[PDB]
Ligand binder design. Structure first.
Ligand SMILES: *[C@@H]1O[C@H](CO)[C@@H](O[C@@H]2O[C@H](CO)[C@@H](O)[C@H](O)[C@H]2NC(C)=O)[C@H](O)[C@H]1NC(C)=O
Ligand SMILES: *[C@@H]1O[C@H](CO)[C@@H](O[C@@H]2O[C@H](CO)[C@@H](O)[C@H](O)[C@H]2NC(C)=O)[C@H](O)[C@H]1NC(C)=O
Ligand SMILES: *[C@@H]1O[C@H](CO)[C@@H](O[C@@H]2O[C@H](CO)[C@@H](O)[C@H](O)[C@H]2NC(C)=O)[C@H](O)[C@H]1NC(C)=O
Ligand SMILES: *[C@@H]1O[C@H](CO)[C@@H](O[C@@H]2O[C@H](CO)[C@@H](O)[C@H](O)[C@H]2NC(C)=O)[C@H](O)[C@H]1NC(C)=O
Ligand SMILES: *[C@@H]1O[C@H](CO)[C@@H](O)[C@H](O)[C@H]1NC(C)=O
Ligand SMILES: *[C@@H]1O[C@H](CO)[C@@H](O)[C@H](O)[C@H]1NC(C)=O
Ligand SMILES: *[C@@H]1O[C@H](CO)[C@@H](O)[C@H](O)[C@H]1NC(C)=O
Ligand SMILES: *[C@@H]1O[C@H](CO)[C@@H](O)[C@H](O)[C@H]1NC(C)=O
Ligand SMILES: *[C@@H]1O[C@H](CO)[C@@H](O)[C@H](O)[C@H]1NC(C)=O
Ligand SMILES: *[C@@H]1O[C@H](CO)[C@@H](O)[C@H](O)[C@H]1NC(C)=O
Lengths: 405, 135, 99, 99, 50
């Protein structure tokens, strides 16, 4: 209706999660042990195919080396390891679930433990990652303890200090809501926050299918290896799949024919496996870049991009580690309890249009007020919060009233 | 059961056998193998090297070196100061230390090596200088 | 010979329903329906907010409201013709079929 | 120059366009029919190659499943199907060409 | 068939890369006004229509 508006009167704090894969398993494959084994004739025949193995070795080495640039780019955002003070009082906000727990041996947070419990020859080995899981934890703890006692300051120079309620006042001021709204509700919002975190825990207890995205990154490896190690029991048109049997039943001049088919089949399988790995690595890097961007723009600062760091107006975020990935806890701001009013875009007075500084003109049936745009708080009209800018015989929908002084 | 002779595994490969005369069941496992890596500073700086045998315990390396092993490019283990046990494998030719520095030549699970009279040392990498802002 | 083609899960009418829902939510609500409940507001006020969002005070719209609307309509009129003349206008989607 | 500035005294409202592909065609392939036809002799020989066909089916199925998540991610942005108001007067703007 | 399937995989990756950008232009141009230069058109963005 062309003269009516709706303005919320009460807010909500909500926490929503988001899971991203970061890195996948490192592998190394040796040709001659896979294709040939210990047989000399097979290697002497394989030397006729050129350099079909140096390329494979180089490609897999490149993938493996790249897998450690993915973790050095998401977590190694800081140069100092900050700590948290012994006095764990932050204006009533309760961070016990996210901060590390010294009692247990591995110094992980309870949510991190919950996350960690929810996720499950022939020249085919696996290399270990460079950063152990007890170092990713230290990066995460430093990131968490720099954003509690400093705000966004530590991402753009020296970490400056400020109490928590003042920081949250800054962050309300950053989405168009005045400071005082927080200070008059400081307790409620704190409680409003404290329960949300709790819900998160239960939301990961009952639901087992929350962490599928990471789980796939594991599963897609096993199959890719299993098939490979199975492809060793296929004849490919020869008389047997075991080199020693052929070498122990046929004259060597008549055995190249049999060995060639096996060699070609195994080369083809290796090439297929390598190509699939290359494509999957491309996808994983594409995801890791987004993870780094989300770490830089939601954790080290407040974002104005819609639906980037959560659904709703944005306040902050907290990283938590996980196997082969990361988990973000976005803290947003959802309005509620809307109430209806009648409005008009001007106030004629003494033959002069009047427009608000910031806010919208609102009527409650008899009286007129100007209020901010996201939380009902009326005010008495006054030249201090309006500007004149023009005459009263042009604008449409203008409603005449008085403006005090 | 009295009618099987061979055996297989989760793949198609024999991993057991029955002796034709001393009718006893025997397992089969292959002999060890794995990769080899050489850890070196540039030839401009120094000329010594260190060697990493991937995915074995050091005792099987020492025994085989005392008896038989390929890659006869043998190094000299003077004392316990040479052999060291990482998560990746046995590291022969480097002395583990107690301090922390920056990572210079990455090796394995948190282990890095560097050239610091001079010799080659392997340590645990450091994530940076500790700090604590006074809330 | 052994090659089959599968139909998409969402029909075209369903996609049109989503498109119409999105269009109808950004006319009577502005951007508010993308962060919670949908709050209503008259359209010229929404356009005044969107002028305020680029560093131009509100009054500029109100004193020009009749003119600006015209400049909008003409633009929306021409697009149709601009989708006839230019051959490569749909160059992208077409290739997706051809390829 | 170090003491001269330029400031505009009039504006323009313009509408551009943009085209983006979202999804492509789903397919599926039956090996035995394509390669060997309906011959019972050929399939026995083909069976000696192990699992060159489960891989292909898995890959094509993965592509086909992803092609639906793409469209679900682009269009299913809201969970309430808003309906346009009956009377269409929005301050002087048509939307008739888009509604 | 192997050639065909590899080609399809590469094209699918390309199409996914392009479809992750429409999902962002639908959130920052359709559900709200944007400040990124030259993102939602050439000029100072006002609004958009799918
Ligand atoms: C805004 O919403 C909050 C959320 O429920 C309201 O808080 C509750 O208020 C009732 C009575 O006002 C209390 O009995 C509850 O205990 C409150 N909940 C909590 C968690 O403390 C609040 O009252 C609402 N305020 C307005 C002005 O509507
Ligand atoms: C922050 O939340 C934690 C989590 O509940 C609180 O720890 C609880 O403390 C009570 C009182 O000792 C125990 O009965 C609960 O078992 C504790 N919870 C858990 C999960 O162990 C903690 O008290 C809160 N912070 C403050 C300052 O009260
Ligand atoms: C800003 O530009 C518009 C468009 O060029 C001007 O509107 C035109 O004004 C002339 C003046 O007589 C009319 O003849 C035209 O019909 C108008 N155009 C349209 C589309 O109606 C406008 O006058 C300019 N602003 C100023 C202050 O001159
Ligand atoms: C939107 O503008 C169009 C363009 O003039 C208007 O459509 C015309 O309407 C008149 C009378 O309704 C018809 O005689 C014309 O044939 C229409 N043109 C076309 C191309 O169909 C339309 O009326 C305008 N919107 C509104 C709400 O009036
Ligand atoms: C728009 O508001 C005016 C009041 O200025 C009213 O007369 C008119 O009926 C409204 N439009 C519609 C379509 O009701
Ligand atoms: C606006 O008022 C009407 C009746 O006056 C009511 O039905 C409607 O719910 C109000 N708007 C909102 C957002 O509640
Ligand atoms: C509008 O607000 C004034 C302010 O006190 C009040 O006196 C009046 O009763 C209100 N009108 C209605 C209809 O509630
Ligand atoms: C150390 O060697 C023994 C055999 O002497 C072996 O059983 C053990 O697994 C090795 N240690 C590790 C950590 O593998
Ligand atoms: C160095 O020696 C100290 C003293 O025993 C020990 O606590 C520390 O762990 C050592 N450093 C290592 C093993 O890297
Ligand atoms: C720049 O300022 C100086 C005065 O310091 C003046 O002499 C000079 O002419 C100015 N430049 C131009 C292009 O006018």
């Amino acid at each position: 209706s062309n003269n009516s508006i709706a303005i919320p009167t009460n807010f909500t704090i909500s926490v929503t999660t988001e899971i991203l894969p970061v890195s996948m398993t490192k592998t190394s494959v040796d040709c001659t042990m896979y294709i040939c084994g210990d047989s000399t004739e097979c290697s002497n025949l394989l030397l006729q195919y050129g350099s079909f193995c140096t390329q494979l070795k180089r490609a897999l080495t490149g993938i493996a080396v790249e897998q450690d640039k993915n973790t050095q780019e998401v977590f190694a955002q800081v140069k100092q390891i900050y700590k948290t003070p012994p006095i764990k009082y932050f204006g009533g906000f309760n961070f016990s679930q996210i901060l590390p727990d010294p009692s247990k041996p591995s110094k992980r947070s309870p949510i991190e433990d919950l996350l960690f419990n929810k996720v499950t020859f022939n020249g085919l080995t696996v290399l270990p990652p460079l950063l152990t899981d007890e170092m990713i934890a230290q990066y995460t703890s430093a990131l968490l303890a720099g954003t509690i006692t400093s705000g966004w300051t530590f991402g753009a120079g020296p970490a400056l200090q400020i109490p928590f309620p003042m920081q949250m006042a800054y962050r309300f001021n950053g989405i168009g809501v005045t400071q005082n709204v927080l200070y008059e509700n400081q307790k409620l919002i704190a409680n409003q926050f404290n329960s949300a975190i709790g819900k998160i825990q239960d939301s990961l207890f009952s639901t087992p299918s929350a962490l599928g995205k990471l789980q796939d990154v594991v599963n897609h490896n096993a199959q890719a290896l299993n098939t490979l190690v199975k492809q060793l029991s296929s004849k490919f048109g020869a008389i047997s799949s075991v080199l020693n049997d052929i070498l122990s039943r046929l004259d060597p001049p008549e055995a190249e024919v049999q060995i060639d088919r096996l060699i070609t089949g195994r080369l083809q399988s290796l090439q297929t496996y390598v190509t699939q790995q290359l494509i999957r690595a491309a996808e994983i890097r594409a995801s890791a870049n987004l993870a780094a961007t989300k770490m830089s723009e939601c954790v080290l600062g407040q974002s104005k991009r819609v639906d980037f760091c959560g659904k709703g107006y944005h306040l902050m975020s907290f990283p938590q580690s996980a196997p082969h990935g990361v988990v973000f806890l976005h803290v947003t701001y959802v309005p509620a309890q809307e109430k209806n009013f009648t409005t008009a875009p001007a106030i004629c007075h003494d033959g002069k249009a009047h427009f608000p500084r910031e806010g919208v003109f609102v009527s409650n049936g008899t009286h007129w007020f100007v209020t901010q745009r996201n939380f009902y708080e009326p005010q008495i009209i006054t030249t201090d919060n309006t500007f004149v800018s023009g005459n009263c015989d042009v604008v449409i929908g203008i409603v005449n009233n008085t403006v005090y002084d | 059961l009295p009618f099987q002779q061979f055996g297989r595994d989760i793949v198609d490969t024999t991993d057991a056998v029955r002796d034709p005369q001393t009718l006893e069941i025997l397992d089969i496992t292959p002999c060890s193998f794995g990769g080899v890596s050489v850890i070196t500073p540039g030839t401009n700086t120094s000329n010594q090297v260190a060697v990493l045998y991937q995915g074995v315990n050091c005792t099987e390396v020492s025994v085989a070196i005392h008896a038989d092993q390929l890659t006869p490019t043998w190094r000299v283990y003077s004392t316990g100061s040479n052999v060291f046990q990482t998560r990746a494998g046995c590291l022969i030719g480097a002395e583990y230390v107690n301090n922390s520095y920056e990572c210079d030549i990455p090796i394995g699970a948190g282990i890095c090596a560097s050239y610091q009279s001079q010799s080659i040392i392997a340590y645990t990498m450091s994530l940076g200088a500790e700090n604590s802002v006074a809330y």
